[PDB]
Amino acid sequence: ARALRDISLFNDIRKDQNSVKYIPSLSAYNVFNEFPYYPTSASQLLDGKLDEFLMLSEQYKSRLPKIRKLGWNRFKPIGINKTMYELEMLRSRARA
Amino acid sequence: WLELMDCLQKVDDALLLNNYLYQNFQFKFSENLGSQRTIEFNIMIKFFKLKVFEELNGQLEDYFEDLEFLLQVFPNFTFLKAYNATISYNNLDYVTAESRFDDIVKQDPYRLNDLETYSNILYVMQKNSKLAYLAQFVSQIDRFRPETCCIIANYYSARQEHEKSIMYFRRALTLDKKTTNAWTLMGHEFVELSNSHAAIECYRRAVDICPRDFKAWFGLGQAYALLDMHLYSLYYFQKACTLKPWDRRI
Amino acid sequence: KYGPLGITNFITPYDLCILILIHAHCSQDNGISVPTAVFLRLISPTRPSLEWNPLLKDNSNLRSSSIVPPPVLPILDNIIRILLDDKDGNKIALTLMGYLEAINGLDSINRLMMDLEKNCLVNNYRSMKMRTTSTRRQMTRASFLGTFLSTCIRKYQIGDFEMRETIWINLQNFKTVFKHTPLWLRFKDNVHIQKVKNCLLANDEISVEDQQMVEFFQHFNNGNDADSKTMNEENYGTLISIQHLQSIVNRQIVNWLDYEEQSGLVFDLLDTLSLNDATKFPLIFILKYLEAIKENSYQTALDSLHNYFDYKSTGNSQNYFHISLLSLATFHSSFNECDAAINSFEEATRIARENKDMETLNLIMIWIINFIEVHPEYANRFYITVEQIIKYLKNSSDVEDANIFSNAYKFETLLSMVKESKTAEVSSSLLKFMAITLQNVPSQNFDLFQSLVSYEVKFWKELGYESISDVYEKFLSKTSSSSLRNYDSSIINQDIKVAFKALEEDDFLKVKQYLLKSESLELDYDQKINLKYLRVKYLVKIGDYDLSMRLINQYVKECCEEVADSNWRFKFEIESINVLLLSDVGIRSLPKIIKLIDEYKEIGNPLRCVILLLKLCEVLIQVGKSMEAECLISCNLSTILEFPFVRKKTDELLESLS
Amino acid sequence: VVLSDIAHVYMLKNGGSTTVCFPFQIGNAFWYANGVILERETSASKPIEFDLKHKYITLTDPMAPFGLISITN
DSSP conformation class of C272: T
B205: closest CA among C514, C279, C623, D32? Answer: C279
Q: Which residues of B touch C311 (CB under 8 A)?
A: 201, 204
Q: Is A18 on the interface with C (CB under 8 A)?
A: no
Half-sphere exposure of C130 (CA within 13 A, CB side): 6
CB distance A57–C154 less than 8 Å? yes
Q: Which residues of C531-543 are buried (b: 16+ CB within 10 A; e: fewer)?
A: bbbbbbbbbbeee
DSSP assignment of C219-246 equals HHHS---SSPPPP-----SEEE-HHHHH
> CA–CA separation, C251 vs C63, rounded Å?
10
**CA D6 vs CA B54, C591, D3, D14: distances in Å:** 22, 63, 5, 22
DSSP conformation class of B192: T
Q: Which residues of D touch B214 (CB under 8 A)?
A: none
CB distance C402–A1 less than 8 Å? yes
**CA B100 vs CA B19, B69, B112, B121, B155: distances in Å:** 33, 18, 16, 12, 21
Where in chain B does DSSP place strands (E)? none
**CA C441 vs CA B155, C58, C406, C429, C437: distances in Å:** 61, 14, 12, 20, 8
**CA C220 vs CA C217, C237, C328, C572: distances in Å:** 6, 20, 56, 85
End-to-end CA distance of chain C: 79
> CA–CA separation, C254 vs C322, rounded Å?
25
Q: List the single residue in B with minimal CA-CA distance to D16.
A: B235
CB distance C299–D16 less than 8 Å? no
DSSP conformation class of C440: S
Give the Cα-Cα-Cα angle C560, C565, C569 (nearest 5 degrees): 65
Rg (CA), chain B: 20
Amino acid at C419: K
CB B165: neighbour CB atoms within 10 A?
Answer: 24
Instruction: Tell me which residue in C314, C343, C350 faces B201 most closely, judged by beta carbons.
Output: C314
Q: List the single residue in A with minimal CA-CA distance to C445.
A: A1
Half-sphere exposure of C255 (CA within 13 A, CB side): 17
Task: Note whether C612 and C579 are within 8 A (CB).
Answer: no
Which subunits sit against C, judged by 3+ Cβ pairs under 8 A? A, B, D
A29: closest CA among A8, A53, A55? Answer: A55
Amino acid at C295: E
D10 φ/ψ angles, rounded to the nearest 5 degrees: -100, 115
Which of B229, B239, B242 to probe by mutation at the C interface, max C CB count within 10 Å? B229
Task: Note whether C453 and C472 are within 8 A (CB).
Answer: yes
Task: Note whether B197 and B187 are within 8 A (CB).
Answer: no
Task: Note whether C481 and C490 are within 8 A (CB).
Answer: yes
CB B55: neighbour CB atoms within 10 A?
Answer: 13
Q: Which residues of C touch B187 (CB under 8 A)?
A: none
Q: Do D and B count as touching (3 or more CB pairs closer than 8 A)? A: yes
Task: Note whether C246 and C7 are within 8 A (CB).
Answer: no
Q: Which helix (H) or strand (E) covers residue D31, if one does?
A: strand D26-32
Beta bridge partners of C122: C140
Q: Is B229 on the interface with C (CB under 8 A)?
A: yes
Nearest-Cα distance to chain D for C300, in Å, is 12
> CA–CA separation, C468 vs C487, rounded Å?
30
Q: Which residues of C368-386 are buried (b: 16+ CB within 10 A; e: fewer)?
A: bbbbbbbbbebbeebeeeb
> CA–CA separation, B94 vs B121, rounded Å?
7
CB distance D17–C340 less than 8 Å? no
> CA–CA separation, C551 vs C490, rounded Å?
28
Q: Is A10 on the interface with C (CB under 8 A)?
A: yes
Amino acid at C638: S
Q: Is D56 helix (H, G, I), strand (E, B) or coil?
A: strand
For chain D, the residues whose C-beta falls within 8 A of a C-beta of chain C are 8, 10, 14-17
Q: Which helix (H) or strand (E) covers residue C449, if one does?
A: helix C446-463
Beta bridge partners of C328: none
> CA–CA separation, C329 vs C64, rounded Å?
30
Amino acid at B160: Q
Give the Cα-Cα-Cα angle C646, C648, C651 (nearest 5 degrees): 105
DSSP assignment of C519-553 equals TTS---HHHHHHHHHHHHHHHHHHS--HHHHHHHH
CB pairs under 8 A between B and D: 21
DSSP conformation class of C385: -
> CA–CA separation, B13 vs B134, rounded Å?
39
> CA–CA separation, C369 vs C390, rounded Å?
10
Cβ-based burial of D49 (10 A; exposed 0-12, middle 13-18, buried ≥19): exposed
Q: Is A63 on the interface with C (CB under 8 A)?
A: no
**CA B20 vs CA B54, B92, D4, D24, D44: distances in Å:** 19, 33, 21, 19, 11
Q: Which residues of D touch B241 (CB under 8 A)?
A: 19
Give the Cα-Cα-Cα angle C392, C425, C610 (nearest 5 degrees): 145
Please give the biggest Cα pair distance in chain D: 46
Number of H helices, E strands in chain C: 33, 4
Q: At what angle do helices C242-257 and C263-270 cross, to 10 degrees?
A: 130
Nearest-Cα distance to chain C for A75, in Å, is 28
- Residues sharing a CB contact under 8 Å with residue C493, sequence separation 6 or more, in sequence order: C481, C527
- Experimental approach taken: cryo-EM
CB C85: neighbour CB atoms within 10 A?
Answer: 10
> CA–CA separation, B237 vs C246, rounded Å?
33
CB distance B227–C351 less than 8 Å? yes
Q: List the single residue in C with minimal CA-CA distance to A49.
A: C316
CB C22: neighbour CB atoms within 10 A?
Answer: 23
**CA C111 vs CA C17, C114, C116, C122, C525: distances in Å:** 15, 5, 9, 18, 68
Rg (CA), chain A: 26
Chain-centre distance for alpha carbon B129: 24
> CA–CA separation, D54 vs B50, rounded Å?
28
Which of A6, A17, A49 to probe by mutation at the C interface, max C CB count within 10 Å? A49
> CA–CA separation, C7 vs B241, rounded Å?
35
> CA–CA separation, B66 vs B83, rounded Å?
14
Q: Is B1 helix (H, G, I), strand (E, B) or coil?
A: coil
For β-strands C5-7 and C238-240, DSSP reports them as parallel
Q: Which residues of A touch B197 (CB under 8 A)?
A: 23, 25
Q: Which residues of B touch A25 (CB under 8 A)?
A: 197-198, 201
CB distance A26–B201 less than 8 Å? yes
